[PDB]
Amino acid sequence: PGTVDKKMVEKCWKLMDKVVRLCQNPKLALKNSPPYILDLLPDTYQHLRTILSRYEGKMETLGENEYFRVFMENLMKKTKQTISLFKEGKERMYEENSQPRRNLTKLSLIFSHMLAELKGIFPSGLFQGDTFRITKADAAEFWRKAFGEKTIVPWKSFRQALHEVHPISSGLEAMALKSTIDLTCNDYISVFEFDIFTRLFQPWSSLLRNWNSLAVTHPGYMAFLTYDEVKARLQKFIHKPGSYIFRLSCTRLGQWAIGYVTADGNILQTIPHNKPLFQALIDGFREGFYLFPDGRNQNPDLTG
């Protein structure tokens, strides 16, 4: 990624401005709920405006920062990709179940993850990536030993370092892992993305066994799904109480959100607290709430 100057941030602002205008089309019927692209892009502009204001007179420091160069490169690519999506999708952007519309929804999630990462690394406009707090002690020790105080590393470097502690059994498994951990879809792993993954799939001691049981082989897990998509996907199971799915919370990154059909005709979503996802799923099955993952009659046996 090349050096980021003030002109490059202004070019991204223009591209984001085009995406905002595309997403103001009333044919989209865009719901004002996270992730909401019409909030995320102006909020990203404002945080970049904040970053630039903290680096007045020291723009050479900001331009050389590796994380910020990777971030701006990804921001330009993602906005260009959204513009191309509208250009090629044409009228299919407004059909609610179309693939081009689903691609826009996934991109909206990516913009939300990117803003969350940017605020985690530049909390008040100043770079603090070297002192980021990985929330699980064992995961923090892994990153420190493998990468010191780095904020971002290429996927290849990350896979190699992880494999030495948690062996990855195959190339296909490594691609599934990458797709899970790389929330910003930039082929890099930030310390912020690593924290999120290791909080979601704790304990560290059995990290990849947990991820395999909760995501790789579990029909209830939904990658890159939003609150509104979970409610929509459960509608077909409104008469099948106990149908449930789960996914990453968008607004509380690092925590799980479980959606389920109640016995009284409601579709509710909850964020487990003070217990790991596996125990929430086990207790929920025993108590009758989480019986049918994605509406399927067989539920995985996690008591093992």
């Binding site: 959100a257 109640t262 929430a280 108590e287």
Partner: peptide, 5 residues
Amino acid sequence: YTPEP
């Protein structure tokens, strides 16, 4: 989001 069932 609502409390856990």
